[PDB]
Design an enzyme around this catalytic site. Structure first.
Site, PDB file in Angstrom:
ATOM      1  CB  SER A 219      -0.690  -0.235   1.579  1.00  0.00           C
ATOM      2  OG  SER A 219      -2.378   0.461   1.126  1.00  0.00           O
ATOM      3  CG  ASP A 242      -3.647  -4.557  -4.167  1.00  0.00           C
ATOM      4  OD1 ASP A 242      -3.231  -3.903  -5.102  1.00  0.00           O
ATOM      5  OD2 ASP A 242      -4.464  -4.222  -3.116  1.00  0.00           O
ATOM      6  CG  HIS A 297      -5.481  -2.548  -0.077  1.00  0.00           C
ATOM      7  ND1 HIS A 297      -4.715  -2.626  -0.717  1.00  0.00           N
ATOM      8  CD2 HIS A 297      -5.208  -1.755   0.668  1.00  0.00           C
ATOM      9  CE1 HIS A 297      -3.859  -1.480  -0.633  1.00  0.00           C
ATOM     10  NE2 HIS A 297      -4.311  -0.621  -0.028  1.00  0.00           N
TER      11      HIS A 297
END
Ligand code: FB2
Ligand code: CL
Ligand code: MG
Length: 371
Positions: A219, A242, A297
């Site tokens: 992230s 991600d 996610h």
């Protein structure tokens, strides 16, 4: 349960803080271990992380107490303060955590890499992107363990471009400083751990394969990967899990000579983010990207393992895909990519077809259309 590692090594875990200040390094180290008979690692080790996770969630302050009652005793399958397995140099991964996470929430990844023979330094960022973190005001405050807490910064819409960039650059610096701390311990620097932990750092002397360094993160951590490789060539490849591309300066995109691997969830990604990933591509540079079918996610962090399938799915902790199968593809593809661009003499090339997205639970490149 957070899964045990799939490799042959026993896994150990410890914390390191050097120095004690808000400018020190804070990390959780996962390492190949000599012994397998130690106490398991406490997953979220302080009540103040639960408070911070509740402030991150924007929930009522009582959610802090609920989260703590549910999870405050949970452990992860790493041997606490196990002696480091001697007689072998280990490649090094520096791991960056997401927004509202902290150093302990990616043990599924950190334990699985360690079980295969890496040392993992999961950093705790002090850039106010963590839900919570702590440090010691001075040598006295460190001595008596009077912890000072730092909580997640909430941003206004105007603050975002500027503060997300200032923070991804601090994150990159914290990755380089964490690396330098590990490299100095490997030399034999006489580092005094700020935490009164019974794992002598002198174990790590001559235990780092000094040419084989990588940066991985999920992230905000995925953007930290890219910023870190651009400013620190000691890192030889990155893997962005991600990645949230928003924090990066438009300057960094053409400034990544290292190999870079995008591993994406299906349902997180969007045109703006994928275009920023594509701005990283040049014919001279090695880039790879895959999408895990059915995934969300949260598949990359340990809360995907923290509840049942029905509650998990409902809270988007889990996706359509099984969490163990999901983390399995992300970790095995990472392992084959690391072997290739770090020059490891292991068997990780058994998973090279995952790099290409060649699995029924894998998409080559992306599902997202950008025209
Ligand atoms: N935002 S994030 O990094 O996905 C995250 C994951 C787990 C807990 C808190 C935050
Ligand atoms: Cl998602
Ligand atoms: Mg630099």
């Amino acid at each position: 349960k957070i899964p045990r590692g799939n490799g042959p090594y026993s896994v150990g875990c410890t914390d390191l803080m050097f120095d004690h200040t808000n400018k020190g390094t804070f990390l959780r180290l996962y390492y190949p271990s000599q012994d397998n008979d130690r106490l398991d690692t406490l997953w979220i080790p302080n009540k103040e992380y639960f408070w911070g996770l509740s402030k991150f969630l924007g929930t009522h302050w009582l959610m802090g107490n609920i989260l703590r009652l549910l999870f405050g005793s949970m452990t992860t399958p790493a041997n606490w303060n196990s002696p480091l397995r001697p007689g072998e140099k280990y490649p090094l991964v520096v791991f960056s955590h997401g927004l509202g996470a902290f150093r302990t929430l990616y043990s599924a990844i950190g334990i699985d890499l360690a079980s295969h023979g890496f040392i993992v330094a999961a950093v705790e960022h002090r850039d106010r992107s963590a839900s919570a973190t702590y440090y010691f005001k001075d040598q006295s405050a460190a001595e008596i363990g009077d912890k000072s807490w730092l909580y997640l910064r909430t941003l206004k819409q105007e603050e975002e471009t500027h503060i997300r960039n200032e923070q991804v650059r601090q994150r990159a610096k914290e990755c380089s400083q964490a690396l330098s701390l590990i490299l100095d311990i490997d030399h034999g620097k006489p580092v005094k751990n700020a935490l009164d932990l019974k794992f002598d750092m002198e174990q790590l002397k001559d235990s780092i394969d000094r040419e084989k360094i990588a940066v991985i993160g999920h992230s905000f951590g995925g953007a930290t990967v890219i910023q870190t490789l651009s400013e620190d060539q000691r890192f030889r490849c990155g893997i962005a899990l991600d990645a949230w591309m928003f924090p990066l300066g438009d300057e960094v995109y053409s400034r990544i000579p290292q190999p870079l691997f995008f591993i994406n969830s299906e349902y997180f990604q969007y045109p703006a983010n994928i275009i920023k990933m594509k701005k990283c591509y040049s014919p001279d540079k090695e880039r790879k990207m895959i999408t895990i079918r059915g995934s969300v996610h949260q598949n990359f962090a340990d809360f995907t393992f923290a509840t049942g399938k029905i509650i998990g799915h409902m809270l988007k902790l889990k996706g359509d895909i099984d969490s163990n199968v999901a983390i399995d593809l992300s970790n095995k593809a990472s392992l084959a990519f690391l072997q290739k661009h770090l020059g490891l003499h292991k068997d990780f090339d058994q998973w090279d077809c995952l790099i290409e997205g060649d699995d029924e639970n894998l998409i080559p490149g992306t599902n997202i259309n950008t025209t």
